Amino acid sequence: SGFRKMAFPSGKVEGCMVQVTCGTTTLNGLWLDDVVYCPRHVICTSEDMLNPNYEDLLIRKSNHNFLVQAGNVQLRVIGHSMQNCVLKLKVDTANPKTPKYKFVRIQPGQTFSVLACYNGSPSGVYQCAMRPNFTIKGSFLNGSCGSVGFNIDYDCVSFCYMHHMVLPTGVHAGTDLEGNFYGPFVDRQTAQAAGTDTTITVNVLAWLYAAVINGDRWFLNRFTTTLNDFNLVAMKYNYEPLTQDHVDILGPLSAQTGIAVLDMCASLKELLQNGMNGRTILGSALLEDEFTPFDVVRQCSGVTFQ
Amino acid sequence: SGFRKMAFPSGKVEGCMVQVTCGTTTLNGLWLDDVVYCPRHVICTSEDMLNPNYEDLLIRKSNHNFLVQAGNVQLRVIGHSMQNCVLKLKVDTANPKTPKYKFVRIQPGQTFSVLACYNGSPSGVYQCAMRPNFTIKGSFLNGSCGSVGFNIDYDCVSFCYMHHMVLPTGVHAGTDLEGNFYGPFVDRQTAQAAGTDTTITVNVLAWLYAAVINGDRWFLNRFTTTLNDFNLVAMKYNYEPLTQDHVDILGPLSAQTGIAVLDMCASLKELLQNGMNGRTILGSALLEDEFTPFDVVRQCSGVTFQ
Numbered sequence: 276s277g278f279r280k281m282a283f284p285s286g287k288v289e290g291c292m293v294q295v296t297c298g299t300t301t302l303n304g305l306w307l308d309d310v311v312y313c314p315r316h317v318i319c320t321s322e323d324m325l326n327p328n329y330e331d332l333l334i335r336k337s338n339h340n341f342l343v344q345a346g347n348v349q350l351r352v353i354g355h356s357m358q359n360c361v362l363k364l365k366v367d368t369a370n371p372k373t374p375k376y377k378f379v380r381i382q383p384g385q386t387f388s389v390l391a392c393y394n395g396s397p398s399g400v401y402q403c404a405m406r407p408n409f410t411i412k413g414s415f416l417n418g419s420c421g422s423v424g425f426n427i428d429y430d431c432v433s434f435c436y437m438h439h440m441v442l443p444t445g446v447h448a449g450t451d452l453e454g455n456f457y458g459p460f461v462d463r464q465t466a467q468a469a470g471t472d473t474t475i476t477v478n479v480l481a482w483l484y485a486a487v488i489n490g491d492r493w494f495l496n497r498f499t500t501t502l503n504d505f506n507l508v509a510m511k512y513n514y515e516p517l518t519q520d521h522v523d524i525l526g527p528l529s530a531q532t533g534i535a536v537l538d539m540c541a542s543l544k545e546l547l548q549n550g551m552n553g554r555t556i557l558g559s560a561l562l563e564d565e566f567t568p569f570d571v572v573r574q575c576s577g578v579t580f581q
Numbered sequence: 582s583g584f585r586k587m588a589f590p591s592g593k594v595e596g597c598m599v600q601v602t603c604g605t606t607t608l609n610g611l612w613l614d615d616v617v618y619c620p621r622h623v624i625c626t627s628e629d630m631l632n633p634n635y636e637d638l639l640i641r642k643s644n645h646n647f648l649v650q651a652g653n654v655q656l657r658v659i660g661h662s663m664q665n666c667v668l669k670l671k672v673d674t675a676n677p678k679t680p681k682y683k684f685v686r687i688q689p690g691q692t693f694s695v696l697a698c699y700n701g702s703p704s705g706v707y708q709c710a711m712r713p714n715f716t717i718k719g720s721f722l723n724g725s726c727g728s729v730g731f732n733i734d735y736d737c738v739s740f741c742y743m744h745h746m747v748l749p750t751g752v753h754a755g756t757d758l759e760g761n762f763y764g765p766f767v768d769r770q771t772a773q774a775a776g777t778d779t780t781i782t783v784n785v786l787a788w789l790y791a792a793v794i795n796g797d798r799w800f801l802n803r804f805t806t807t808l809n810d811f812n813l814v815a816m817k818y819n820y821e822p823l824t825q826d827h828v829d830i831l832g833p834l835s836a837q838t839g840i841a842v843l844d845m846c847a848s849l850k851e852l853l854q855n856g857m858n859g860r861t862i863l864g865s866a867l868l869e870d871e872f873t874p875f876d877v878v879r880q881c882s883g884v885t886f887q
């Protein structure tokens with residue numbers, strides 16, 4: 276009963292959040308095994324951020340210039356390296372709360388949970404989606420960098436995101452845990468464009484399937500459509516083109532509810548052309564695109580983790 | 582930058598979730614010190630739930646009839662009692678992961694985080710509000726009972742909610758940690774009415790203040806109003822009557838943004854009478870009422886916890 280935008284239990288990630296200062300800049304770090312990961316602009320002064328030469332800036336930095344604090348105790352830095360836009364601080368103490376983890380470069384349209392932190396302490400947890408334009412719509416203030424996004428599979432934490440900056444439009448940009456930015460973004464204080472953000476069409480359809488499962492069915496029509504004719508409406512409304520892979524991913528939900536994918540596409544077509552007439556679906560007046568088909572199955576069947 | 586419905590870090594609560602079975606019924610329990618708290622209908626069979634006599638049902642139950650599992654190890658039950666609609670199972674082992682905690686009966690309009698669990702294992706975490714009619718709009722399936730709602734103050738966990746049942750309208754009902762139901766609800770399988778749910782007016786105003794802080798200002802008008810004239814619009818649109826206490830709680834946000842409370846009430850009045858004209862505020866097409874004034878200050882200033 277009910278459908279909510281819920282996030283993973285963040286307990287396994289809270290144990291990995293540390294505080295990292297270099298000079299006057301302080302941000303968060305990810306402590307896994309004997310390595311601490313954090314954005315590389317921790318070495319930047321307020322002036323350096325306009326056009327930083329990270330190679331020249333890092334060279335004037337030694338191990339003792341990095342203050343890594345895990346709660347009450349410090350970590351002795353015994354090595355540092357720069358991998359893309361992230362620093363890897365080698366410490367002498369392995370994190371005893373290190374969970375089973377791996378690094379994953381997420382795909383556009385997929386979702387993950389963000390644990391927003393400040394000064395190495397967690398502040399909150401929320402669910403976001405990697406937009407098609409490789410941005411996210413999160414809640415990040417000054418000091419939030421180094422906060423990580425992740426997914427949980429039973430006991431395996433798949434880290435996929437690390438926050439770095441906000442764009443002029445208010446959306447946020449970051450990297451994977453190997454330091455590669457999602458999108459055409461660079462870690463420099465300059466006006467960067469994210470481009471036209473389209474709607475994750477497969478996610479909208481999966482959300483409409485969750486609505487029928489929960490009792491909202493007023494949007495179910497008596498029409499059908501073709502992939503090509505739907506994508507003619509989709510492209511006009513800045514929606515992702517639907518593919519046969521997208522149809523196959525929506526397969527299990529289509530068989531469960533007995534509603535063909537193309538029939539659900541026709542219901543979504545009328546919604547784009549006629550609006551919503553002041554009505555709501557699952558308590559929303561807009562078409563939600565931050566629930567993937569796997570997020571619908573997980574919440575509607577009660578999948579748990581460690 | 583950005584405003585999201587974020588939940589507290591659930592790490593301190595994950596360590597307290599256990600599994601409780603009595604007969605064939607299995608639900609979640611809250612393990613604090615040497616006591617396990619769980620809903621009392623764990624002693625009910627599928628037939629008993631229609632009209633249970635918990636006094637007569639509990640009397641035929643002994644300590645060994647309660648299977649309390651905390652992950653891989655069992656807890657030896659050495660005592661049981663019934664406090665209102667919750668059972669207090671005394672165990673021989675104090676939970677080593679017990680955080681600083683206390684029990685709080687939340688007020689209508691306040692918010693808290695829910696950690697949805699199944700079989701004693703966390704499944705997800707989301708933020709909800711205690712509606713004026715003492716219901717919540719959560720995501721709860723079969724097996725979710727015993728899941729708890731809570732707030733975190735630095736290192737103190739204030740447990741305030743325990744899930745018990747869903748209503749015919751799809752909303753959920755539960756108790757405090759002393760077993761007293763929020764609302765006129767009883768733990769029995771029967772059609773129970775929740776009454777007219779009104780909108781938390783002070784929460785809507787605090788959300789509009791968060792919008793101005795984040796850049797959404799199109800709803801700011803050039804009118805003003807009186808508490809009485811606003812409440813004339815409020816009562817018509819099923820909104821909570823605004824009081825001087827509500828104005829005082831919105832004080833710090835009013836002084837921060839330089840917008841008088843009554844002026845913000847006038848902007849909210851026009852929104853109720855004219856709708857939204859297909860526009861969005863903070864990415865929503867509806868007026869959000871699940872952010873309290875304290876939830877706005879916390880997210881817009883970066884308050885952290887342990």
Ligand SMILES: *[C@H](O)[C@H](C[C@@H]1CCNC1=O)NC(=O)[C@H](CC(C)C)NC(=O)OCc1ccccc1
Pocket residue numbers: 302316319324415416417418419420421439440441442443447461462463464465466467582
């Ligand atoms: C790191 O904590 C911080 C996060 C920002 C601060 C406010 N909201 C956020 O998401 N990121 C930065 O300070 C970043 C540093 C660069 C070296 C990457 N700069 C940044 O986010 O500037 C915002 C901006 C840049 C250019 C045009 C408009 C805005």
Ligand SMILES: *[C@H](O)[C@H](C[C@@H]1CCNC1=O)NC(=O)[C@H](CC(C)C)NC(=O)OCc1ccccc1
Pocket residue numbers: 276608622625630721722723724725726727745746747748749753767768769770771772773
């Ligand atoms: C406990 O896990 C369960 C939670 C329900 C199951 C589906 N969604 C939920 O929130 N609660 C119950 O099973 C509860 C047991 C009573 C003894 C309190 N009964 C219940 O929720 O029944 C739902 C209902 C009752 C009457 C009319 C319409 C629906």
